[PDB]
Amino acid sequence: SHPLELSEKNFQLNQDKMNFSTLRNIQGLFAPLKLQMEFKAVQQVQRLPFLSSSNLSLDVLRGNDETIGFEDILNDPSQSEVMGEPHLMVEYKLGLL
Amino acid sequence: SRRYDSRTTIFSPEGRLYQVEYAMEAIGHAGTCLGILANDGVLLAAERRNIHKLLDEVFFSEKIYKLNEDMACSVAGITSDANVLTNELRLIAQRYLLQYQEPIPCEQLVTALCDIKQAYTQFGGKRPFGVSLLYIGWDKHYGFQLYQSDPSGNYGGWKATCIGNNSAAAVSMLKQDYKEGEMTLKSALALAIKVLNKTMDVSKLSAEKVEIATLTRENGKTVIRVLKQKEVEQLIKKHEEEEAKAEREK
Amino acid sequence: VYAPPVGGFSFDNCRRNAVLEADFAKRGYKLPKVRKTGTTIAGVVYKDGIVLGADTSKIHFISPNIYCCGAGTAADTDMTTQLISSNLELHSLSTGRLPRVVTANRMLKQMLFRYQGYIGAALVLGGVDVTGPHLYSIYPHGSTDKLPYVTMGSGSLAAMAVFEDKFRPDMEEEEAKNLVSEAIAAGISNIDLCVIS
Amino acid sequence: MFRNQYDNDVTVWSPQGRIHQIEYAMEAVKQGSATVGLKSKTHAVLVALKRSELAAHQKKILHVDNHIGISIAGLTADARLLCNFMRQECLDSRFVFDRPLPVSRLVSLIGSKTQIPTQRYGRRPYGVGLLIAGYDDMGPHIFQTCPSANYFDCRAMSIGARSQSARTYLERHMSEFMECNLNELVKHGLRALRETLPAEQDLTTKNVSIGIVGKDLEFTIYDDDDVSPFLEGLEERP
Amino acid sequence: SYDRAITVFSPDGHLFQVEYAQEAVKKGSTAVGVRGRDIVVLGVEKKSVAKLQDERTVRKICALDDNVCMAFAGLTADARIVINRARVECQSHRLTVEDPVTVEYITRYIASLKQRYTQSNGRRPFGISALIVGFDFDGTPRLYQTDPSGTYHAWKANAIGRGAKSVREFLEKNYTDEAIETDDLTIKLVIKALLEVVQSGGKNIELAVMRRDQSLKILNPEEIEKYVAEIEKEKEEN
Amino acid sequence: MFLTRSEYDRGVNTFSPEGRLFQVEYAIEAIKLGSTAIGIQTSEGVCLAVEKRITSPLMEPSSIEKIVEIDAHIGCAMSGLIADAKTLIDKARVETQNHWFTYNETMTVESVTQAVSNLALQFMSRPFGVALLFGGVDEKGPQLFHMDPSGTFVQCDARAIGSASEGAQSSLQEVYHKSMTLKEAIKSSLIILKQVMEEKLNATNIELATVQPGQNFHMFTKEELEEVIKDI
Amino acid sequence: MAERGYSFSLTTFSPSGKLVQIEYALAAVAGGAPSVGIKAANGVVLATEKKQKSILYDERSVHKVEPITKHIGLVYSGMGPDYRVLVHRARKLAQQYYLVYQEPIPTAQLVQRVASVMQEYTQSGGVRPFGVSLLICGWNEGRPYLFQSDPSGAYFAWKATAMGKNYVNGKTFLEKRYNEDLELEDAIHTAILTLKESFEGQMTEDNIEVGICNEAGFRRLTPTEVKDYLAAI
Amino acid sequence: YNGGAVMAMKGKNCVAIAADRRFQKIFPMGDRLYIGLAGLATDVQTVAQRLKFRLNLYELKEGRQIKPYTLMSMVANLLYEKRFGPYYTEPVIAGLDPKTFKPFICSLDLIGCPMVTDDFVVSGTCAEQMYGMCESLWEPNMDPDHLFETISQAMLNAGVIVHIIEKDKITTRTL
Amino acid sequence: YLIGIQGPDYVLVASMFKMSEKILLLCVGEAGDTVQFAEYIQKNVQLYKMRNGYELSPTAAANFTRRNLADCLRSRTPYHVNLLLAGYDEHEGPALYYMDYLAALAKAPFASVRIIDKNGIHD
């Protein structure tokens, strides 16, 4: 489609990865480990896939609380215009699909 | 039971989920919403539960949230749950109106949020969305309808029904004094005041302690129309005029 | 997939949109066209403030003290300055202090770097924050330099020639905005002197 | 009795100050049968006491790569997982570096593999000890692993069921082994295996597998009547 | 003990939580099946009225394909999902295979979906069972049963949910080739088996009639009542 | 000096003091709750037979349960839970399909049971409540196997599993000999299934499916069963 | 009975149909720092009591009355950590709304969105509700607005209300006092006096904070202004 | 390909969104509020329907009728969503305000840039031509009767549909 | 080459793979995509019928097949059909929704002899 397609698709991946690299190299192995364990715990707390979820704990742990991007303000996913079956959506998240 | 009553994943020896039955009890303790499907339309009479003197209303309706042009719903149960559920009802309808350019036929929309609420039982770690909603509707298939949905997803269709407080009581009063086929919205609005007034003991249905919304059809357009203070004042004073006439008769 | 959808730029038309391009081009046919600033823009530093010149205006808002000219695409200059405005309002709201021109600059640069100058925001970013009168040269590709003066867009060369000829290290306010006006005048269309102290 | 509260997780300590579910995994070695493992300067022998004749063929001794294999005493799901892991380690050592993998190193890889579970919730200790016998440049190897993530280097050992009998034999003749042949070292291993057996029972080329690697020798699992020739020479339970 | 998790066994060797979803089936509304001579019928009781309730919105016989239909008799919302999803998978098959989709195929899907909900205790098995009848490409009449446990099974006469055994035992006798030969007789049979199930006849009954040529097409309560009066006239003759 | 209610037997992860995972052995009791499946590998093939335990004359005996085909040469006989059998049948069948779509070879019986013990041994959040019995005649030759709750496999010559696992494996112990013919295996599986079954063996209440080096895995018909179980 | 199983978990309903972790997060609210919202003719006042009344405190640091957009702010009783992260979010959503609709977020709209955060945090398991309630006021469409969002995420418009401590006493005093036509010059005094009902000490620019909405928009009253209102009452 | 461009004029609490016919240009949104989407017909249809989805939801939520400016904001948002691989359209949000009934007209390009004019605008592929013609014919304060002529004329000069949006009752003039 | 002749109830059409009892679809263009997409959408309207108890109106089915062809084009850069939906609605009356290579719609009286009527479909 476009170069930016994938640069934006994996934007967050290929940033927090770089954060963990920096912390490994300066602070130590512990510093990524600690941040990772917090993030995964607070993104085991959201709604089922099929309802649009407000993950205040994960956002403020990243420092996104006080920062907007195009991610937020384009292609509004909270008024998603294409949703599936509740049960089948949840199965996909579980990895039964 | 003392067990099988926790996770909403855990069946009983009988085959009962007591979690989901306690979500039904949470409807039990909510605003009486009395719907009566009619000939001319389908009305959504209510108890306007919260009527404090300092409490303000900066909204169009209290418990009655409208869905698209052709449908509206009421709310009895958990208020926060209901807020997200009634936003979701609008969004469901609009996705069908984006793909097929038709205002969602009524059964589809009810069923869609029932699948949501059936997931919110199926999957343990979620809470059974503790709301019932009474859906006044028109569609091209089935003229006018009244519906219900439950926390479970168990949903039905009705000629008259109730949700909330003194709800089984109210449905009994409807089963006495409803006449399927004869029941114009006029006589349904009369029955609605009557049954509310008979099921709950609120002075003489104080007009700010009841609300109705009439989903009718005018010049082939669906008209979801809240009854004014004035207009439920007219329905209740006329109900009381008939009560007094009948008191003289007896 | 049965995966919740997310927000941002959507890259789905892209190849089919490029099939439209290919067909129409080939036959000799028109498709709707991107709308631009095509503005001479300008900026200066003086003793204790900034001026931002433009022609008709290119000067947009960031913060109470920070303003930001727009050369390039009009869509994109306006979009970036408005989003970065909102970002520096959020920053300021929590901080307790009006936001900085270093903050504006870092953010603009980094955002325009992410999107690799496929969005046309060649901006002259001038504010007078706590640390004093700052001017930058934000570019679409997420580059910038912190310059005493800079011009971009439509006759930038003529404007920059005026600037560099008729600049003094520490100006007065009125001679500073005089410079940006005569620089705009060289590139050109009303002179647009957004003076800052 | 008080250990009650703290014995039913692998990621909880006790007032006493010991994780009991790792000690219970180290009891689950004993639910599997008595493997012996003993080496010389030329060869590293294993033997296995195979607990129907038609059903449950029971493959106690397993071959990992040319230079290396194991014998199994305890949980067999875990035995499989661990062996298969080692096969991959050695495959990759001979794919990238184009050499064998040190036995010490490969037992250390299994060590850390088997520590993750014990210091993780939703996990349990691999419930099996191995006798990990390879040959390197170094010379022959035996390497006991425990169901607990800790492990040993050995020149002789037995793990499994009523296996103290074997351990005792292997101490009594520990010195012999260093300077034994292939087949001498094997009969020594089998006499440890036979010390474990009741006196009414015997080896009788039936409950004998023999897993020998060495200098030119590759890890070869003699079973059924390929163990007969080794048990020819062995004589006199007394 | 082992009825406080979906995904645990017992010393006696049972998933009691899965059998409690089958007790939720057992608290059903009698759904009856027959698989006759170029006919299938699904009689199922209406159970309750509620004077002022639309019946369209609450029906026990749902159609899955041109040549598949079913009669569910457990929980209602659980069954709604199963049936919605049986139509999803029916359409998937139909599109890809280019076949009018087998009954067996989608009984196996319904089964495997319930098996997918049997294999977590952070999920629950749909506590519903369906008598998925119909025909094949060629036209072979079918009747099946699907279970919360998530097994499919093939049948000729069936009777599930409320008073399951009662009505199965009626069919053990009254299901015969001279009550099958014609479509009249198989309709009569399910009605007369529901005249064991529930007191009322032509009143609380909702009866699907799919043929080799035809599809579900739910009957009228007047049509069923005719056949209730036919078997009543047979009872007058006997 | 006090009695405690300590439970290691609710959790499949939890070890007894002796070092026992009870839930796996409680799923072995669930194999024993299922139906008897007798396989006999021979020199001239491997047979699988298995009881259907048909209860009513309303349930369709014409339909085939309890036995499956996975490729040309290999199938298995399921026994314990049919719902759990299914997902391991699918593994075997797709991974040997993939073997034929990779190497243009049909996967060896030992390697199919490897593939199946990769989909098993992964607790599905419970010890698989099925035992399969993988009888194929591969490149190498005839082969019977046995799968269990723990997830692993083990090689067999004569195995009975299910209802009367050891009731019917003791019959195999007397009956089977190394130089069995596939005809012998067929008849012996069946006649021992007969003397296990509380019902009388006809062709309607048994699935047999058997493979030889020559004649690839097929499902013994009504008539073939009838003939053998007339003799036996 | 004790019925304590039901009163630990926020995902459970009780035998009678109660959600009890909600009620105990509202108990955290009901042991809060007294706030009073009085929506008056000429704007709203959010006059509140400070949880510090100390010789050692930096006046410029902490604010009970925070703006979200120009024209909106809010005040809280219950939890400070929780409040602060909820208003970081509030500000975000106001600016998202102004990048989508380019309209300063209506007080009602913002209230919905911050109460939809509250909705999620009672819904899900392995989290707690927020133990804080929010008097989100502000000025739109030539109109004052006041709301009251909850731990649960139920929100309601108000002419006059109170939360925190002696807060039912607050609303009693305020039912006796508040007039529909009471304008904001007199509502700040009324809110100061509703605090006096629910106060413990001597009341000063230090020991309370006030912040008001208007035609103009929302702000906090300077220590000077607050003590001048206390001097005028 | 029949791209076209569509005019709209400022009047006396009336606007005359005048849009070419030879695909659908005129799409109603609010009481006295329309959009003139011209360009590629397929992207016009798609982005008008997506806009209507977003719009209906906003409307349900707010309680009020959308202001032409807020509608224009959503239009720009849904076009900038496709910054890379655009919807080939140029909308113009030409209505009276639901509350003020203040004439308001504003063209967009295919990646947004909303731009509001206080005489008239034109939006689309042909926009240049009838813009010139409109200026030549344009008058300050345009009662809706003679308004019609100015805006049909110019469009046709470059059979069009002039929806003369009105305070009292919207007129339409297909030609 | 597809033919479109919509009438009072009389939607004569020629090429041709039908959606419902009383709807035809015509599909031409990229031999393959053509009948693939006709079958696909003829089975999507079937799913809707089997689920809801009523099939898609010509109008609903046309809106639907445009949303389905739009995303086909976006994904596969030919994914080319030219399409009519010669329909009849129980609620309305006849239809003939011509559709472009990039998924447009136009009810198009000028777009076998399959008459698409209240009575059904009449080759």
Side-chain angles (χ1 to χ4, degrees), chain H residues 65 114 124 142 173:
Chain H
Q65 295 160 237
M142 308 290 274
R173 290 293 201 79

Side-chain angles (χ1 to χ4, degrees), chain A residues 22-75:
Chain A
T22 302
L23 285 159
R24 169 70 194 89
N25 297 347
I26 296 166
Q27 298 200 353
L29 282 158
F30 76 88
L33 162 58
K34 295 243 290 287
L35 289 177
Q36 285 271 28
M37 285 287 284
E38 294 151 15
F39 300 143
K40 65 182 291 301
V42 300
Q43 76 204 334
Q44 288 158 238
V45 186
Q46 60 262 25
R47 288 163 193 282
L48 291 183
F50 56 79
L51 305 185
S52 48
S53 60
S54 45
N55 297 5
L56 181 53
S57 280
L58 184 74
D59 288 42
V60 68
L61 276 178
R62 286 296 224 284
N64 304 337
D65 61 293
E66 57 162 308
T67 316
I68 290 166
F70 284 113
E71 281 183 337
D72 297 349
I73 62 148
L74 301 178
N75 198 350

Side-chain angles (χ1 to χ4, degrees), chain G residues 4 29 80 99 110-111 124 144 182 220 224 232:
Chain G
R4 296 287 187 185
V29 155
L99 284 159
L110 178 74
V111 157
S124 312
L182 179 85
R220 69 182 60 83
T224 314

